Swiss-Prot record, chain A:
Binding site for substrate: 54, 74
Top-level taxonomy: Eukaryota, Viridiplantae, Streptophyta, Embryophyta, Tracheophyta
Name of the featured protein: 2-alkenal reductase (NADP(+)-dependent)
Keywords recorded for this protein, A-Z: NADP, Oxidoreductase
EC class of the enzyme, as a word: oxidoreductase
Residues the record lists as binding NADP(+): 156-157, 177, 181, 197, 221, 243, 265-267, 315
Amino acid sequence: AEEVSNKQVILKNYVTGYPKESDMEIKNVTIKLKVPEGSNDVVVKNLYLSCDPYMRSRMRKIESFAPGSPITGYGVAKVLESGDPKFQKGDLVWGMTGWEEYSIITPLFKIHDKDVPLSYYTGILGMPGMTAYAGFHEVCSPKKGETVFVSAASGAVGQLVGQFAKMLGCYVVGSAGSKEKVDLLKSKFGFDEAFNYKEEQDLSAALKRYFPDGIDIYFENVGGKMLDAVLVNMKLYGRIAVCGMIEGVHNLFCLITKRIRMEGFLVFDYYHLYPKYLEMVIPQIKAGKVVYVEDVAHGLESAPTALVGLFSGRNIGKQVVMVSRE
Amino acid sequence: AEEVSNKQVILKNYVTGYPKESDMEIKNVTIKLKVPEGSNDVVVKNLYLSCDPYMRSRMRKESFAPGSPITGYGVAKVLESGDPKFQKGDLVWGMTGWEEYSIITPLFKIHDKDVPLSYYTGILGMPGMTAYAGFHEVCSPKKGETVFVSAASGAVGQLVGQFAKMLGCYVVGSAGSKEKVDLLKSKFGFDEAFNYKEEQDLSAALKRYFPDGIDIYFENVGGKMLDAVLVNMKLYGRIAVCGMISQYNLEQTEGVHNLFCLITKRIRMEGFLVFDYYHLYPKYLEMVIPQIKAGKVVYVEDVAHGLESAPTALVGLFSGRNIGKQVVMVSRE
C-alpha cells in the first residue's frame, strides 16, 4: 500500500475565550493509504476544507472536538481507496473529513458535476447552500413579492439566502458588520438594501426605515437584540427561520399578536432534498445568475489563521483552505 | 323607547402594576333601549361577563379608555335589532360592555341552552375555541406524545389537558397552588402536575416529569417557565404560543435566554390567535357539547354575582384568587 507523510491540524486544547492560532498545532505523521480490514471506510486525499462558524462551539467542552486529534469539518476530497461499494478510487466527494492531507472516513456525497470549481462544494454546492435552501425555500415557504430580512447577510449562508429571495421576486435587506460588507451586499449580491448594524443606535428604528410595511420573512442567523428588533417589525403571519444565533429576548409576545411561526431547523435533516437543490442552483450558476465570493487560504499551515480569522469576522464571504492543488 | 337605568363598570385610570379594585368604579346612567336610527346595531341585555387575563394588558397605554365602560366577552339577550340576522329574544355571545345593557355593532347566536349559559364565556366561547384551535391545529398532536401545559387550571389550559388526554397523550400541568394541582389530577385527568412555586429549579422539575422530553408545550405563561421548557423539548417539538400571563403586569418583560434550543431540537414555536380559527367553531361545538353532556369533558368556573362584584372578580383573576374560569353574572334571564 502507499505510505505517505500526512500533515494535520491538531486541536491542542479546549478554548475558553478568544480562539487563537496557539490553540492548534501542525503535526506531521505517516499514514498508510489502505482501507482498514473488514470496514467500509473510505480513504481520501483532502483538497479543500471549509471554515464554518458552527465549528467554534466544537472547540469548547460540551459532539465537540478532542484535544490531541485533528480538527474535522466539511471539505472536498478525492477518493484513493474504498471499502464502500458506492465510492471508487478517483471519485470526487464532499462532506465531513479531517483537517489533514489524508483522511480515513467512516460511514458523504459524490460529486457529479466538475464544470464548476470544486471549491463551490464547500459553499453554494455544499452545506452552506443546502442550509440557505432548506431555511429559505422549505421553512419560510416564501412567495413572490414578500419582504425578506437576513442577519449576518455577508456570511456563506446569508449571501445565498438573499440571492435566492431575489430570484423569487422578493424585496431583500441584509445586515452586516462593516461598510465593505454592506457595499458588497448591494453591489455584488443584489440585495435591495443593506445596513451596518454596528452604526445603528436603534435596531427597531433602522428596520422600520427599510421595511415601512413590515417584514414577511426573517432568516435568523443572530438572535438576541437583533431578533427583538425584527419581532416588532414583522407582518401578520410572518415567518422566522432560526438557522443560527450568536442577550435575553423580550418581544416574544409579538409571536401572538402577529401570529408568527418561528422555526429552527438543521440542514442535515434536508440532505434527501440535495439533488433537487442541485437542479435549481446549477443552471443559475451557469447563466451567471447566482454569484459567490470567497477567501481562499493556501496550505494546511495557513488553516489555523484562516479559522481564527473567520470566527473573528476578519474576512469577506466564505472562508476556505486549499489543502493542495490539482 | 324604554329608558332604564344602566349600571356600568368604568375604567377609572390606566394601571401601573397589579390592578386594584379602585382602578374601577360603578356609574349609573340612563339608556334609551333603541337601535340608533341609521344603524344595523343590536340592543342587548347583558347576562354574563367573562374575566379574561388578556384584559390586564388593555388597562395600560385597542386599549380601554379611562372614563368609559370596560368591554370584553359576554353572553347577552337581544332586546332590539337593526340586523336581520338577530331577533328580539335571541341569546348571543361576543364582545359587549361591562354594563347592564349595551348597544353593539354586529357575535354568535346561541342555539343550545341545555348547557349552562355561563359556559359561553369559557368552554363554549373564546377560551374553549382557543384551547381547541391551539391544541388541535397548531400543535399537530399525535397519540402517545408528551404534552406540558402551563397555567393548566386556567380556562384554556384545563381544556387543553383534557383534549390531550382524549388523544392518548401523556399530560403534565403547572399551577400556582396545591389546591389547583390536586384539581388538575383529580378532576381534569392530567397524568401529573406540579406547583411551580414549590420548585427550586423549573428545568429540573420538568426533567423529572418528562424523562425523555416534551413533544408539545402549550404556552400560557412565558418568561422563566418558557426557558425551562426549551431545555426539555424533544426533537421536532412544538410550542403553541397562546398567552404569556406572567408578563402582563410587568413594567418591562423578562428576557428569554434559551432560544438556541429551537435550532438543536428543531422546534416550531408558533403564535396564534383564536380570531383566525372561528371557521372551526361549528366543528368544535358539535364535538364538545356531546362530551360535556356525557361528563367526558369537565369544566370548573367561578360565577361572581352582580356588576358590583366585577372589579373584585377581575382583580382576583389577575392575582390567582379564582379556581378555573372567572365569570360575573350580571342578571338572570
